[PDB]
Amino acid sequence: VVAAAEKTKQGVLYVGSKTKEGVVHGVATVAEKTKEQVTNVGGAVVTGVTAVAQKTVEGAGSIAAATGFVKK
Amino acid sequence: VVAAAEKTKQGVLYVGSKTKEGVVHGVATVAEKTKEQVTNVGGAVVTGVTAVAQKTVEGAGSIAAATGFVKK
Amino acid sequence: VVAAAEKTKQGVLYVGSKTKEGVVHGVATVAEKTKEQVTNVGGAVVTGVTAVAQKTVEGAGSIAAATGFVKK
Amino acid sequence: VVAAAEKTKQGVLYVGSKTKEGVVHGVATVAEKTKEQVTNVGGAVVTGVTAVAQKTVEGAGSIAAATGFVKK
Amino acid sequence: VVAAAEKTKQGVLYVGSKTKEGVVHGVATVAEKTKEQVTNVGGAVVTGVTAVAQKTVEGAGSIAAATGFVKK
Amino acid sequence: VVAAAEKTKQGVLYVGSKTKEGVVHGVATVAEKTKEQVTNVGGAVVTGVTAVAQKTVEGAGSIAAATGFVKK
Amino acid sequence: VVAAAEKTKQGVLYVGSKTKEGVVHGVATVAEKTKEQVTNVGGAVVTGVTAVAQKTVEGAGSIAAATGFVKK
Amino acid sequence: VVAAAEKTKQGVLYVGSKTKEGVVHGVATVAEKTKEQVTNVGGAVVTGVTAVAQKTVEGAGSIAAATGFVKK
Amino acid sequence: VVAAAEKTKQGVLYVGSKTKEGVVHGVATVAEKTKEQVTNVGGAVVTGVTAVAQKTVEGAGSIAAATGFVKK
Amino acid sequence: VVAAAEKTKQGVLYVGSKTKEGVVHGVATVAEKTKEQVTNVGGAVVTGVTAVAQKTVEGAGSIAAATGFVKK
Amino acid sequence: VVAAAEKTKQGVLYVGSKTKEGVVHGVATVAEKTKEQVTNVGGAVVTGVTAVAQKTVEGAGSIAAATGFVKK
Amino acid sequence: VVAAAEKTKQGVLYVGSKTKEGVVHGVATVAEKTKEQVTNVGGAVVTGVTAVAQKTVEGAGSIAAATGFVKK
Numbered sequence: 132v133v134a135a136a137e138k139t140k141q142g143v144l145y146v147g148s149k150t151k152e153g154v155v156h157g158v159a160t161v162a163e164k165t166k167e168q169v170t171n172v173g174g175a176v177v178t179g180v181t182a183v184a185q186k187t188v189e190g191a192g193s194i195a196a197a198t199g200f201v202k203k
Numbered sequence: 204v205v206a207a208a209e210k211t212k213q214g215v216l217y218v219g220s221k222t223k224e225g226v227v228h229g230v231a232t233v234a235e236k237t238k239e240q241v242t243n244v245g246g247a248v249v250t251g252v253t254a255v256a257q258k259t260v261e262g263a264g265s266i267a268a269a270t271g272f273v274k275k
Numbered sequence: 276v277v278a279a280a281e282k283t284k285q286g287v288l289y290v291g292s293k294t295k296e297g298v299v300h301g302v303a304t305v306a307e308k309t310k311e312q313v314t315n316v317g318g319a320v321v322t323g324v325t326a327v328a329q330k331t332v333e334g335a336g337s338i339a340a341a342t343g344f345v346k347k
Numbered sequence: 348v349v350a351a352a353e354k355t356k357q358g359v360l361y362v363g364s365k366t367k368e369g370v371v372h373g374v375a376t377v378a379e380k381t382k383e384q385v386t387n388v389g390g391a392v393v394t395g396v397t398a399v400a401q402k403t404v405e406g407a408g409s410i411a412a413a414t415g416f417v418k419k
Numbered sequence: 420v421v422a423a424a425e426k427t428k429q430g431v432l433y434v435g436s437k438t439k440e441g442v443v444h445g446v447a448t449v450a451e452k453t454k455e456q457v458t459n460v461g462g463a464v465v466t467g468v469t470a471v472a473q474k475t476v477e478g479a480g481s482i483a484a485a486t487g488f489v490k491k
Numbered sequence: 492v493v494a495a496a497e498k499t500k501q502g503v504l505y506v507g508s509k510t511k512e513g514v515v516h517g518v519a520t521v522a523e524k525t526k527e528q529v530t531n532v533g534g535a536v537v538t539g540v541t542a543v544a545q546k547t548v549e550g551a552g553s554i555a556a557a558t559g560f561v562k563k
Numbered sequence: 564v565v566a567a568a569e570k571t572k573q574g575v576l577y578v579g580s581k582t583k584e585g586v587v588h589g590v591a592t593v594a595e596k597t598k599e600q601v602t603n604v605g606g607a608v609v610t611g612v613t614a615v616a617q618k619t620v621e622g623a624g625s626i627a628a629a630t631g632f633v634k635k
Numbered sequence: 636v637v638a639a640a641e642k643t644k645q646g647v648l649y650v651g652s653k654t655k656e657g658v659v660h661g662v663a664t665v666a667e668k669t670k671e672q673v674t675n676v677g678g679a680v681v682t683g684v685t686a687v688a689q690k691t692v693e694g695a696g697s698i699a700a701a702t703g704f705v706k707k
Numbered sequence: 708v709v710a711a712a713e714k715t716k717q718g719v720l721y722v723g724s725k726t727k728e729g730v731v732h733g734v735a736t737v738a739e740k741t742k743e744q745v746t747n748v749g750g751a752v753v754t755g756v757t758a759v760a761q762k763t764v765e766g767a768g769s770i771a772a773a774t775g776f777v778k779k
Numbered sequence: 780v781v782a783a784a785e786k787t788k789q790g791v792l793y794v795g796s797k798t799k800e801g802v803v804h805g806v807a808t809v810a811e812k813t814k815e816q817v818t819n820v821g822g823a824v825v826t827g828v829t830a831v832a833q834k835t836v837e838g839a840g841s842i843a844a845a846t847g848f849v850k851k
Numbered sequence: 852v853v854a855a856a857e858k859t860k861q862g863v864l865y866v867g868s869k870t871k872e873g874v875v876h877g878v879a880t881v882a883e884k885t886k887e888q889v890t891n892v893g894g895a896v897v898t899g900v901t902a903v904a905q906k907t908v909e910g911a912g913s914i915a916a917a918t919g920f921v922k923k
Numbered sequence: 924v925v926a927a928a929e930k931t932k933q934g935v936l937y938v939g940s941k942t943k944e945g946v947v948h949g950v951a952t953v954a955e956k957t958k959e960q961v962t963n964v965g966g967a968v969v970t971g972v973t974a975v976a977q978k979t980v981e982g983a984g985s986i987a988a989a990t991g992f993v994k995k
Contacts, residue, residue: 132204132267132268132269132276132277133204133205133206133267133277133278134205134206134207134265134266134267134277134278134279134339135206135207135208135265135278135279135280136207136208136209136262136263136264136265136279136280136281136335137208137209137210137263137280137281137282138209138210138211138262138263138281138282138283139210139211139212139282139283139284140211140212140283140284140285141212141213141285142214142215142216142258142286143215143216143286143287143288143289144215144216144257144258144286144287144288144289145215145216145217145218145219145289146218146219146253146255146257146289146290146291147218147219147220147289147290147291147292148219148220148222148252148253148291148292148293148294149220149221149222149293150220150222150223150225150252150292150293150294150295150297151222151223151224151294151295151296152223152224152225152295152296152297153222153224153225153226153252153294153296153297153298154225154226154227154297154298154299155226155227155250155251155252155298155299155300156227156228156229156231156250156300156303157229157230157248157250157300157301157302157303157322158229158230158242158244158248158301158302158303159228159229159230159231159232159233159300159303159305160232160240160242160303160304160305160306161231161232161233161234161303161305161306162232162233162234162235162237162240162305162306162307162309163234163235163236163306163307163308164235164236164237164307164308164309165234165236165237165238165239165240165306165308165309165310166237166238166239166309166310166311167238167239167240167241167309167310167311168240168241168304168306168309168311168312168313169240169241169242169311169312169313169314169315169344169346170241170242170302170304170313170314170315171241171242171243171244171315171342171344172244172245172302172315172316172317172318172320172342172390173244173245173270173316173317173318173340173341173342173390173414174244174245174246174247174248174268174270174318174319175246175247175248175318175319176244176248176250176301176302176318176319176320176321177248177249177250177251177254177321177326178229178250178251178299178300178301178320178321178322178323178326179250179251179252179299179321179322179323179324179325179326179398180251180252180253180292180294180297180299180323180324180325181251181252181253181255181290181292181324181325181326181327182249182250182251182253182254182255182321182326182327183253183254183255183256183257183290183325183326183327183328183329184255184256184257184259184327184328184329184331185255185256185257185258185288185290185327185328185329185330186257186258186259186261186286186288186329186330187256187259187260187328187330187331187332188259188260188261188262188263188264188331188332189261189262189330189332189333189334190261190262190263190280190282190332190333190334190335190354191208191262191263191264191280191281191282191332191334191335191336191352192263192264192265192280192332192335192336192337192338193264193265193267193278193279193280193336193337193338193339193350194264194265194266194267194268194278194338195206195265195267195268195276195277195278195337195338195339195340195350196245196267196268196269196276196318196338196339196340196341197245197268197269197270197276197340197341197342198243198244198245198269198270198271198317198318198341198342198343199270199271199273199342199343199344200241200243200271200272200273200344201273201343201344201345201346201347202241202273202274202275202346203273203275203346203347244318245318245342251326262282263280265278267278276348276349277349277350278349278350278351278411279350279351279352280351280352280353280407281352281353281354282353282354282355283354283355283356284355284356284357285357286358287358287359287360287361288358288359288360288361289361290361290362290363291361291362291363291364292363292364292365292366293365294364294365294366294367294369295366295367295368296367296368296369297366297368297369297370298369298370298371299370299371299372300372300375301372301373301374301375301394302373302374302375303372303375303377304375304376304377304378305375305377305378306377306378306379306381307378307379307380308379308380308381309378309380309381309382310381310382310383311381311382311383312376312378312381312383312384312385313383313384313385313386313387313416313418314374314376314385314386314387315387315414315416316374316387316388316389316390316392316414316462317388317389317390317412317413317414317462317486318390318391319390319391320373320374320390320391320392320393321393321398322371322372322373322392322393322394322395322398323371323393323394323395323396323397323398323470324364324366324369324371324395324396324397325362325364325396325397325398325399326393326398326399327362327397327398327399327400327401328399328400328401328403329360329362329399329400329401329402330358330360330401330402331400331402331403331404332403332404333402333404333405333406334352334354334404334405334406334407334408334426335352335353335354335404335406335407335408335424336352336404336407336408336409336410337350337351337352337408337409337410337411337422338350338410339348339349339350339409339410339411339412339422340348340390340410340411340412340413341348341412341413341414342389342390342413342414342415343414343415343416344416345415345416345417345418345419346418347418347419348420348421349421349422350421350422350423350483351422351423351424352423352424352425352479353424353425353426354425354426354427355426355427355428356427356428356429357429358430359430359431359432359433360430360431360432360433361433362433362434362435363433363434363435363436364435364436364437364438365437366436366437366438366439366441367438367439367440368439368440368441369438369440369441369442370441370442370443371442371443371444372444372447373444373445373446373447373466374445374446374447375444375447375449376447376448376449376450377447377449377450378449378450378451378453379450379451379452380451380452380453381450381452381453381454382453382454382455383453383454383455384448384450384453384455384456384457385455385456385457385458385459385488385490386446386448386457386458386459387459387486387488388446388459388460388461388462388464388486388534389460389461389462389484389485389486389534389558390462390463391462391463392445392446392462392463392464392465393465393470394443394444394445394464394465394466394467394470395443395465395466395467395468395469395470395542396436396438396441396443396467396468396469397434397436397468397469397470397471398465398470398471399434399469399470399471399472399473400471400472400473400475401432401434401471401472401473401474402430402432402473402474403472403474403475403476404475404476405474405476405477405478406424406426406476406477406478406479406498407424407425407426407476407478407479407480407496408424408476408479408480408481408482409422409423409424409480409481409482409483409494410422410482411420411421411422411481411482411483411484411494412420412462412482412483412484412485413420413484413485413486414461414462414485414486414487415486415487415488416488417487417488417489417490417491418490419490419491420492420493421493421494422493422494422495422555423494423495423496424495424496424497424551425496425497425498426497426498426499427498427499427500428499428500428501429501430502431502431503431504431505432502432503432504432505433505434505434506434507435505435506435507435508436507436508436509436510437509438508438509438510438511438513439510439511439512440511440512440513441510441512441513441514442513442514442515443514443515443516444516444519445516445517445518445519445538446517446518446519447516447519447521448519448520448521448522449519449521449522450521450522450523450525451522451523451524452523452524452525453522453524453525453526454525454526454527455525455526455527456520456522456525456527456528456529457527457528457529457530457531457560457562458518458520458529458530458531459531459558459560460518460531460532460533460534460536460558461532461533461534461556461557461558462534462535463534463535464517464518464534464535464536464537465537465542466515466516466517466536466537466538466539466542467515467537467538467539467540467541467542468508468510468513468515468539468540468541469506469508469540469541469542469543470537470542470543471506471541471542471543471544471545472543472544472545472547473504473506473543473544473545473546474502474504474545474546475544475546475547475548476547476548477546477548477549477550478496478498478548478549478550478551479496479497479498479548479550479551479552480496480548480551480552480553480554481494481495481496481552481553481554481555482494482554483492483493483494483553483554483555483556484492484534484554484555484556484557485492485556485557485558486533486534486557486558486559487558487559487560488560489559489560489561489562489563490562491562491563564636564637564701565637565638566637566638566639566699567638567639567640568639568640568641568695569640569641569642570641570642570643571642571643571644572643572644572645573644573645574646575646575647575648575649576646576647576648576649577649577651578649578650578651579649579651579652580651580652580653580654581653581654582652582653582654582655582657583654583655583656584655584656585654585656585657585658586657586658586659587657587658587659587660588660588663589660589661589662589663589682590661590662590663591660591663591665592663592664592665592666593663593665593666594665594666594667594669595666595667595668596667596668596669597666597668597669597670598669598670598671599669599670599671600664600666600669600671600672600673601671601672601673601674601675601704602662602664602673602674602675603675603702603704604662604674604675604676604677604678604680604702605675605676605677605678605700605701605702605750605774606678606679607678607679607681608661608662608678608679608680608681609681609686610659610660610661610680610681610682610683610686611659611681611682611683611684611685611686611758612652612654612657612659612684612685613650613652613684613685613686613687614681614686615650615685615686615687615688615689616687616688616689616691617648617650617687617688617689617690618646618648618689618690619688619690619691619692620691620692621690621691621692621693622640622642622692622693622694622695622696622714623640623641623642623692623694623695623696623712624640624692624695624696624697624698624764625638625639625640625696625697625698625699625710626638626698627636627637627638627697627698627699627700627710628636628678628698628699628700628701628702629636629700629701629702630677630678630701630702630703631702631703631704632704633703633704633705633706633707634706635706635707636708636709636773637709637710638709638710638711638771639710639711639712640711640712640713640767641712641713641714642713642714642715643714643715643716644715644716644717645716645717646718647718647719647720647721648718648719648720648721649721649723650721650722650723651721651723651724652723652724652725652726653725654724654725654726654727654729655726655727655728656727656728657726657728657729657730658729658730658731659729659730659731659732660732660735661732661733661734661735661754662733662734662735663732663735663737664735664736664737664738665735665737665738666737666738666739666741667738667739667740668739668740668741669738669740669741669742670741670742670743671741671742671743672736672738672741672743672744672745673743673744673745673746673747673776674734674736674745674746674747675747675774675776676734676746676747676748676749676750676752676774677747677748677749677750677772677773677774677822677846678750678751679750679751679753680733680734680750680751680752680753681753681758682731682732682733682752682753682754682755682758683731683753683754683755683756683757683758683830684724684726684729684731684756684757685722685724685756685757685758685759686753686758687722687757687758687759687760687761688759688760688761688763689720689722689759689760689761689762690718690720690761690762691760691762691763691764692763692764693762693763693764693765694712694714694764694765694766694767694768694786695712695713695714695764695766695767695768695784696712696764696767696768696769696770696836697710697711697712697768697769697770697771697782698710698770699708699709699710699769699770699771699772699782700708700750700770700771700772700773700774701708701772701773701774702749702750702773702774702775703774703775703776704776705775705776705777705778705779706778707778707779708780708781708845709781709782710781710782710783710843711782711783711784712783712784712785712839713784713785713786714785714786714787715786715787715788716787716788716789717788717789718790719790719791719792719793720790720791720792720793721793721795722793722794722795723793723795723796724795724796724797724798725797725798726796726797726798726799726801727798727799727800728799728800729798729800729801729802730801730802730803731801731802731803731804732804732807733804733805733806733807733826734805734806734807735804735807735809736807736808736809736810737807737809737810738809738810738811738813739810739811739812740811740812740813741810741812741813741814742813742814742815743813743814743815744808744810744813744815744816744817745815745816745817745818745819745848746806746808746817746818746819747819747846747848748806748818748819748820748821748822748824748846749819749820749821749822749844749845749846749894749918750822750823751822751823751825752805752806752822752823752824752825753825753830754803754804754805754824754825754826754827754830755803755825755826755827755828755829755830755902756796756798756801756803756828756829757794757796757828757829757830757831758825758830759794759829759830759831759832759833760831760832760833760835761792761794761831761832761833761834762790762792762833762834763832763834763835763836764835764836765834765835765836765837766784766786766836766837766838766839766840766858767784767785767786767836767838767839767840767856768784768836768839768840768841768842768908769782769783769784769840769841769842769843769854770782770842771780771781771782771841771842771843771844771854772780772822772842772843772844772845772846773780773844773845773846774821774822774845774846774847775846775847775848776848777847777848777849777850777851778850779850779851780852780853780917781853781854782853782854782855782915783854783855783856784855784856784857784911785856785857785858786857786858786859787858787859787860788859788860788861789860789861790862791862791863791864791865792862792863792864792865793865793867794865794866794867795865795867795868796867796868796869796870797869797870798868798869798870798871798873799870799871799872800871800872801870801872801873801874802873802874802875803873803874803875803876804876804879805876805877805878805879805898806877806878806879807876807879807881808879808880808881808882809879809881809882810881810882810883810885811882811883811884812883812884812885813882813884813885813886814885814886814887815885815886815887816880816882816885816887816888816889817887817888817889817890817891817920818878818880818889818890818891819891819918819920820878820890820891820892820893820894820896820918821891821892821893821894821916821917821918821966821990822894822895823894823895823897824877824878824894824895824896824897825897825902826875826876826877826896826897826898826899826902827875827897827898827899827900827901827902827974828868828870828873828875828900828901829866829868829900829901829902829903830897830902831866831901831902831903831904831905832903832904832905832907833864833866833903833904833905833906834862834864834905834906835904835906835907835908836907836908837906837907837908837909838856838858838908838909838910838911838912838930839856839857839858839908839910839911839912839928840856840908840911840912840913840914840980841854841855841856841912841913841914841915841926842854842914843852843853843854843913843914843915843916843926844852844894844914844915844916844917844918845852845916845917845918846893846894846917846918846919847918847919847920848920849919849920849921849922849923850922851922851923852924852925852989853925853926854925854926854927854987855926855927855928856927856928856929856983857928857929857930858929858930858931859930859931859932860931860932860933861932861933862934863934863935863936863937864934864935864936864937865937865939866937866938866939867937867939867940868939868940868941868942869941869942870940870941870942870943870945871942871943871944872943872944873942873944873945873946874945874946874947875945875946875947875948876948876951877948877949877950877951877970878949878950878951879948879951879953880951880952880953880954881951881953881954882953882954882955882957883954883955883956884955884956884957885954885956885957885958886957886958886959887957887958887959888952888954888957888959888960888961889959889960889961889962889963889992890950890952890961890962890963891963891990891992892950892962892963892964892965892966892968892990893963893964893965893966893988893989893990894966894967895966895967895969896949896950896966896967896968896969897969897974898947898948898949898968898969898970898971898974899947899969899970899971899972899973899974900940900942900945900947900972900973901938901940901972901973901974901975902969902974903938903973903974903975903976903977904975904976904977904979905936905938905975905976905977905978906934906936906977906978907976907978907979907980908979908980909978909979909980909981910928910930910980910981910982910983910984911928911929911930911980911982911983911984912928912980912983912984912985912986913926913927913928913984913985913986913987914926914986915924915925915926915985915986915987915988916924916966916986916987916988916989916990917924917988917989917990918965918966918989918990918991919990919991919992920992921991921992921993921994921995922994923994923995
């Protein structure tokens with residue numbers, strides 16, 4: 132999971148949301164009468180009503196992420 | 204999972220949303236009377252009503268992600 | 276999970292949200308009559324109503340994250 | 348989980364939220380009649396109504412985070 | 420969990436929130452009739468109504484965090 | 492959990508919140524009829540109604556934090 | 564408009580209404596750029612969402628009503 | 636408008652209403668740029684959300700009402 | 708407008724209302740740029756959310772009402 | 780407007796109201812830029828949220844009311 | 852406006868109201884830039900949140916009321 | 924306006940109100956830039972939050988009221 136970025140040197144953005152009665156669920160794990168319930172999160176979870184990302188990563192960025200799960 | 208980016212050197216964007224009674228579900232794991240319920244997330248989960256990404260990655264960016272699952 | 280960023284040298288952004296009766300859930304782990312319930316979070320969880328990220332990572336940034344789970 | 352950033356040298360941002368009756372839940376672990384309930388958080392959890400991040404990481408930043416879980 | 424940052428040398432930001440009857444919950448661990456209930460937090464938990472971060476990390480910053488959990 | 496920062500050398504920010512009847516909960520551990528209830532916090536927990544961080548980390552900063560939990 | 568009633572001597576009732584977003588208008592007189600706008604009411608106007616009349620006029624009742632309008 | 640009533644001598648009632656967002660208007664007289672706007676009421680106007688009349692007029696009752704309007 | 712009543716001699720009632728966001732208007736006279744605006748009320752106006760009348764007029768009652776309007 | 784009543788001789792009532800955000804207007808006379816605005820009330824105006832009348836007029840009652848308006 | 856009553860000889864009542872944010876207006880006369888604004892009241896105006904009248908007029912009662920208005 | 928009453932001879936009542944943020948207005952006369960503003964009251968005006976009248980007029984009562992207005 133190696134990540135790299137490099138940069139060498141030598142506009143109206145509008146988002147509009149009009150809502151009412153808005154219900155949002157992200158990662159949901161609903162269960163009844165179980166034995167093992169594991170919720171492993173290691174990435175990027177974004178929840179909301181107006182999830183807006185504007186003009187991100189102007190220069191160099193690295194989001195190197197690694198997750199794992201071992202069961203024996 | 205090797206990732207790299209390099210950059211060397213030598214407009215109105217409009218999103219409009221009008222809603223009412225909006226229900227959004229992302230990753231859902233619904234169950235009854237189980238034994239093992241595992242939800243492993245290691246990537247990128249975006250939930251919402253207006254999920255807007257504008258003019259992202261202007262320069263160099265790396266989203267190198269790796270996930271795994273071992274069951275024995 | 277190695278991450279790196281490098282940068283060498285030698286616009287109105289509008290988000291508007293109008294809501295009422297807004298219910299948002301992020302990571303949810305609902306259960307009844309279980310034995311083991313583990314919620315491991317090691318990434319990035321963003322919850323809200325207006326989750327806005329504008330003009331992030333102007334220079335160099337690294338979000339190298341690693342998660343794990345061992346069960347024996 | 349090694350992370351690094353380097354930088355060498357030689358605009359109105361508006362977010363507006365109008366709400367009423369807003370209920371937000373982040374990480375939730377609801378259960379009844381269990382034996383072991385563990386909630387391990389080691390990343391970044393942001394909850395609210397207006398979760399806004401503007402012009403972050405102007406220079407060099409590192410958010411290297413590592414989490415673990417051992418069960419035997 | 421090694422993190423580093425380096426920097427060498429040789430705009431109105433508006434957030435407005437209008438609310439009423441706002442209930443926010445961050446990390447929640449609700450249970451009944453259990454045996455072991457552990458809530459380990461070692462990252463960064465931000466809760467509120469207006470969670471705003473503006474122009475953070477102008478220079479060099481490191482948020483290297485590590486968490487663990489051993490059960491035998 | 493090693494962290495470091497280095498820096499070598501040789502704008503109106505407005506947040507406004509108007510609320511009424513606002514209830515905020517941070518880390519919550521509610522239980523009934525248990526045996527062991529442990530709440531270990533070793534990171535950074537911010538609770539409030541207007542949690543605002545403006546222009547933080549102008550120079551060099553390190554928030555290296557480590558947490559642990561051993562159960563035998 | 565003569566009215567009379569006479570009376571000489573010698574059971575579950577259920578109404579249930581389940582609604583949401585209900586708009587009711589009774590007598591409406593909407594106009595623009597007029598000269599004379601008269602609304603004469605002399606009878607019986609009942610407005611609502613659940614207008615229920617149960618087991619009315621057990622004995623003797625008289626609702627003798629008279630209205631008039633003269634224009635010269 | 637003569638009215639009379641006479642009486643000589645010698646059960647569960649349930650109304651249930653469940654609503655939300657209910658707007659009720661009775662007698663309305665809306666106008667713009669007029670000269671004479673008269674609203675004469677002389678009868679019986681009942682407005683509400685649950686306008687319920689149960690077991691009215693057990694004995695003798697008289698609601699003799701008269702209205703008038705003269706314009707010259 | 709003569710009214711009379713005479714009487715000579717010789718049960719659970721349930722109303723239940725569950726509401727939220729309820730707006731009720733009775734007699735309304737809205738105008739702009741007029742000359743004469745008269746609102747004459749001489750009958751019976753009942754406004755509310757739960758306008759309930761139960762078991763009224765057990766004996767003898769008279770609601771003889773008269774209204775008038777002269778314009779010359 | 781003559782009224783009379785005569786009487787000669789020789790049960791759980793439940794009203795329940797559950798509300799929130801309730802706005803009630805009775806007789807309203809709203810105007811702009813007028814010359815004569817007269818509001819004559821001579822009957823019976825009942826305003827509220829729970830306008831309840833239970834078991835009224837057990838014996839003899841008279842509500843003889845008269846109103847008038849002369850304009851020359 | 853003659854009224855009379857005569858009477859010759861020879862039960863749980865429950866009202867319950869649960870509210871919050873309740874605004875009630877009775878007789879309202881709102882105007883701007885007028886010449887004559889007269890509000891004549893001579894009947895019976897009842898305003899409130901819980902306007903309850905229980906078991907009124909057990910014997911003999913007379914509410915004979917007369918109003919007038921002369922304009923020349 | 925003659926009124927008379929005569930009477931010759933030869934039960935739990937519960938009202939409960941639970942409120943918060945309650946605003947009540949009775950007779951209101953609001954104006955701007957007028958010449959003559961007269962408010963004549965000669966009947967019966969009852970304002971409050973819990974306006975309760977229980978078991979009134981056990982014997983003989985007379986509420987004979989007369990009002991007038993002369994304008995020349």
